[PDB]
Amino acid sequence: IVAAVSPAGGDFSDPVTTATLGITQVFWGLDKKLAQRKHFPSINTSVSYSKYTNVLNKFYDSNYPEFPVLRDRMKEILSNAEELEQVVQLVGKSALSDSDKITLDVATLIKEDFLQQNGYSTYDAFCPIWKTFDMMRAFISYHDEAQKAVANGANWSKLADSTGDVKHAVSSSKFFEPSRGEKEVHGEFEKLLSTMQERFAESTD
Amino acid sequence: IVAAVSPAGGDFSDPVTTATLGITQVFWGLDKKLAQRKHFPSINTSVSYSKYTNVLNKFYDSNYPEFPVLRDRMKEILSNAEELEQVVQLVGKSALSDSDKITLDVATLIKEDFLQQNGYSTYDAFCPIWKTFDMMRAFISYHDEAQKAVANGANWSKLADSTGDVKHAVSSSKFFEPSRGEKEVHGEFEKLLSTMQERFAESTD
Amino acid sequence: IVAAVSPAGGDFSDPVTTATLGITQVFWGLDKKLAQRKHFPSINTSVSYSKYTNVLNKFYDSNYPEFPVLRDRMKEILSNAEELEQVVQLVGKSALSDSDKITLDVATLIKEDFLQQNGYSTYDAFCPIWKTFDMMRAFISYHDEAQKAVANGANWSKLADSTGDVKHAVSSSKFFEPSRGEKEVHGEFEKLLSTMQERFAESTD
Amino acid sequence: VFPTRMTLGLMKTKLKGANQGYSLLKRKSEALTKRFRDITKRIDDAKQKMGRVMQTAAFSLAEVSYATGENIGYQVQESVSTARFKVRARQENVSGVYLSQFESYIDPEINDFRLTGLGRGGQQVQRAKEIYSRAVETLVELASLQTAFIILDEVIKVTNRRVNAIEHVIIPRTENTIAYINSELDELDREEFYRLKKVQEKKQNETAKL
Amino acid sequence: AEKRTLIAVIADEDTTTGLLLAGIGQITPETQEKNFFVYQEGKTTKEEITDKFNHFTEERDDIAILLINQHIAENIRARVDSFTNAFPAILEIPSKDHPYDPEKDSVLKRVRKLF
Amino acid sequence: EGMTRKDHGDVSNQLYAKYAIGKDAAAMKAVVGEEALSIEDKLSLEFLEKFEKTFITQGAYEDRTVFESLDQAWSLLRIYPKEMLNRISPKILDEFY
Amino acid sequence: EGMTRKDHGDVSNQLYAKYAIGKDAAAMKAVVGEEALSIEDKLSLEFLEKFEKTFITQGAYEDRTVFESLDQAWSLLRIYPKEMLNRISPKILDEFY
Amino acid sequence: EGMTRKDHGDVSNQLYAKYAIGKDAAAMKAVVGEEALSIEDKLSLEFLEKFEKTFITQGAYEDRTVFESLDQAWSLLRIYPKEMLNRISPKILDEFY
Question: Which CATH superfamily is domain E1-115 in?
């Protein structure tokens, strides 16, 4: 059952929304402000839970996807982002370390590619579950490398210049279609994992 | 019909004020913060309108006044003043142009001189259309000239210090009766224009 | 009647609490931090008031105590102490000197001796009217003479080290017996006055 | 004025925002103020240090000028038109703020002139020049803390304004708003019930009656 | 980053010349103007120091550190204090023939109120 | 008149208007700090402090006369130039600041 | 198509996002100061003013065609280069920039 | 006491205190960095992390006895020296650290 809700009582703790959130098992957010600004369907990561996740992810795990491990790290990046968001507003940008900048920066990539959904079905708005894992795999493979570089010495700015080409590709993931690489995932994504490694070795040195 | 109402909830959110406001064409607010500084009747641009204003200012224009233009500007000068004041309070005045001070400075003269008009005499209680024109005309003229003065060289402080007595000369015009000068325009306001122009040259210098 | 109240609906501004503060003549707060430290009741000088004080200080003064003079001075010292700490944060220590440093120190000794109790001893739970009078008499005598001594030439650290035995003996008056000079009268305080005079000679010189 | 129903969720989060802001900026302030105190003490000492060493070298040069004959120092000033000790500036993040720092590099453009050699009189200028170079280089390195110190001086004033500004204007405005709309909001839920209940009693009475 | 390389001076003769031997200021060859100002106490006017200060802070955008003798900063006191920038840094040093007074130093004056 | 000044009401208007301004200037002092404040605020800061411990502090078995209160007002109100004192007419003002 | 462009949906999306950021930044300017602000936020402050005074300001008798209105929307949008605009599909962007 | 050791009440004072200080210290790290961060708070920053990731993170069918729970507690506090665990008796602390 996919059920839409909306307020109806002039309150944010309204009788329709409260009694339904109890009986529901998957809760995926959505914010009105983001949706107007162009990010529909929108999603709120701290105002969501899903009880079925544990079995379902394990199902995707056996078929090919490395899926469970990725899911926890995507939320994690976004959690730290909220904390960062308040410091960023107040003090500014001129005080955050190299690690913290990345957290925001990979967060941008997820916001761009998942939360926005270009068209009815144009711009390949249809992503299969296996493509989605590949879209995510590209960002978190980038996050771990990105976290290692700053830690092993490499300025946020330097690391951004040097990443260059592999970063544009992951940014461009949503226009691409999986039906011309295999049939459900892209040969282009497999090639992307090799390219990441190569880039990283040059850039660190 | 000119009808007073009041709060009943200690707000303008109560059913009484809002219903009577729904119907109305002229709205003249209430400002507790201005009332303390000894201003009565206390109004602000943000809490008042008259849908009759356009047609009314043209009518006033015929009699002698520059009234349409001056009313546009009257609104703008008070609205810009409010936004600036929030930054001065919170952040400081020392992170903000001399120019932004100027808007506030001219605005203040309008705040005491217009708003407080509760009068202690008939001379300070009556203000004909001509006299109302005159006091507004001298203040806008001061603003325009002052921003130039500081911009080609002249500090803030020096400008403030110099105009000095002139700021007062308009302040006191209300206390004096309007039957004086040519008609209902004081010789004190007539001279005041020359004194203003004579002042800009010295301030600038 | 001493009645306890808590928040009701989770707001402590709701009708119940607010109705009762108006009727009350006596208020003594509770704070979670002060409660952890073993100060009970958890009061300072602004989370508490008594308007019964006036008649009461008059009653006690009659009995023999010099009570009204000493009590007022107690309140003043706590109020000041708080205030000098804020200055140390914003202004700095440049507004701090040793006269102020003695003020902080007297308040600390007053907190430990008065405010902190938990019934470690039997003499820490019943202390007569005459004993209470005697503790405040030591600390105010220390204060005025420490300040005089640093003005004829002395330092805070030097005063602190020098007062020493007496300072220790008077803090420990709560553990000590209240039947030492009779049955309600404590002998140590009577012998403090003389020690303090000889002591003041050691601190100055 | 303030919203009729449910500002409270928003105002809750406004209340939270305000309060976190005050804590963090007071920590940022706390670190700047703590570091500044230490730097203030270094500086008072250093000023005496620089003055004494600079003057000792000053006195040695002055005697030299007089003994050699003529005011040598006018001649030296014209003739010199390049500098050995320059600085290349770098940014250092201390206490979340970016400061300017200076790092000296000694260029070998000049090391001897045409006034440190004259013959016998020249040997005196030379002995003087050497005390001055050693003394001065130290003074340049100590001067580096000054530049940062002045930027610190500026930043503490701004940062202090902010902790006090959140405290006085924002937090109590937020208390006053949240309370007025909470009480209105509650009034709606209770009066609604009261009007409906009062009417029901009548409807019930009529049916029993007829 | 780098935008300032010179260390300049306002000082008495023996102090200035010595600073130059140590190798810290220079004269620009294109303007024919010194990045130091010599001064002699009681003998050279208060007004000239005031100009030279303006030449160094606001017209020179290459002076990294402006050094200044305490006695001398005291003559043009307004000018030294009112400049609150670190670009240039102002470093007041005890003047030759005078000890260290902590209140002839512009940055320390400012320090005392608000830590 | 004959028991009050007609100036009595006029004097009240200065006292109330300045008190407020003063109260605002103290609010800015708390936030921004004195150095930041301009000359107008400093005067007003000063007025506020004098108002609290002298005007509204009196005894509890101590009577006052209306004449007497206004004479106390004039001294305290006397901390501003004639440009800034303008909530009373130049005639009455020229006599008494 | 034939009376409205294909860019039309894309164009609205861009205006909201910048207009929104600009508003958010103006609020932070007010409390904390311009230490929070950044260069991007300056583009945004500037973008709020251009939008309000050009797009939203028009007659009560000054009618327009839809094609003109999309042409004026574009004018405002020219101040961010292509790489900071991502509310339009890049394919469409290259045509109309 | 008999199936729980005596140290439970004491240990809870230390874990609670550090945990509080620890939330605040992480927010401070984000701004100040680690070039001017306080030492006490630096250990508390690391403390926030372990308190979550081992004392609060456990298995699905992982069961731990109360004695065990107490031991883990001391291990997290073991990093701090004695002079930053000063709210506990030297007898208890010397045994349990």
Answer: ATPase, V1 complex, subunit F (3.40.50.10580)
